[PDB]
């Protein structure tokens, strides 16, 4: 349509180099809290017992 | 040229569809440029640039206008398929073309 874009094959590559030096921290308080709560939520939604 | 004859075959397919739908000689057969880009995209390959493949398709159509099979694209990006195509690719000629293409494929093996 007259405009360039970045295919996925470049999305991944740029995700690579810019995670070499100073990638954002994952092991954190917030990530553990979020997975805590998500594990809480998903479990309560599967077993259909009312 | 072979790549031109491929587009000729595609045009002839569209023409037979239109002809068998509306009958023979009823008004004029028309096709939109949109429908022709995908068809070639199967064979000629995809260069990942709509501009370049559009230029390729327009160049092919222009080279076919030199043979009198199609008009040039008009305002709505549509092209009339001149009825002369019905004679350029008919049973006998298609049979000869198929034989030659099979011979080429056999050589390739």
Closest CA to B84 of B28, B2, B4, B22: B28
Work out how many CB contacts closer than 8 A connect A with B.
Answer: 3
Backbone angles phi, psi at A16, to 5 degrees: -75, -60
Q: What is the CA radius of gyration of chain A?
A: 19
Q: Report whether B10 contacts B39 (CB < 8 A).
A: yes
Within 10 angstroms of residue B79's Cβ, the number of other Cβ atoms is 23
Elucidation technique: cryo-EM
Backbone angles phi, psi at B28, to 5 degrees: -125, 145
Resolution in angstroms, to 1 decimal, for this deposition?
3.7
Q: Report whether B10 contacts B36 (CB < 8 A).
A: yes
* Chain B neighbors of A8, CB-CB under 8 A: none
* Chain A neighbors of B48, CB-CB under 8 A: 7
**Six-digit token string for B57:** 């398709």
Looking at the complex, does the CB of residue A8 fall below 8 Å from at least one CB of chain B?
A: no
Task: Determine the 3-state secondary structure of B30 from DSSP.
Answer: strand
């Amino acid at each position: 349509d007259g405009r360039i874009f970045a295919t996925d094959a470049l999305e991944v590559a740029i995700t690579f180099v810019e995670s070499l030096d100073n990638r954002f921290m994952t092991s954190t308080a917030s990530r553990l809290s979020t997975v805590q709560r998500e594990i809480e939520n998903l479990e309560t939604r599967l077993n259909p017992n009312p | 040229n072979l790549e031109q004859s491929l587009l000729v075959a595609i045009l002839r397919q569209h023409f037979v569809a239109w002809e068998q739908e509306s009958g023979t000689g009823a008004s004029q057969a028309q096709i939109a440029i949109d429908d022709l880009l995908p068809q070639l995209q199967i064979y000629l390959g995809d260069p990942g640039s709509e501009s370049k493949e559009r230029t390729r398709l327009l160049t092919l159509l222009d080279q076919l206008k030199g043979h009198g099979l199609v008009t040039s694209p008009d305002a709505h990006e549509r092209i009339v398929i001149r009825p002369i195509i019905a004679h350029l690719a008919d049973p006998i000629n298609l049979q000869a073309l198929l034989a030659w293409l099979r011979e080429q494929i056999a050589q390739q093996t």
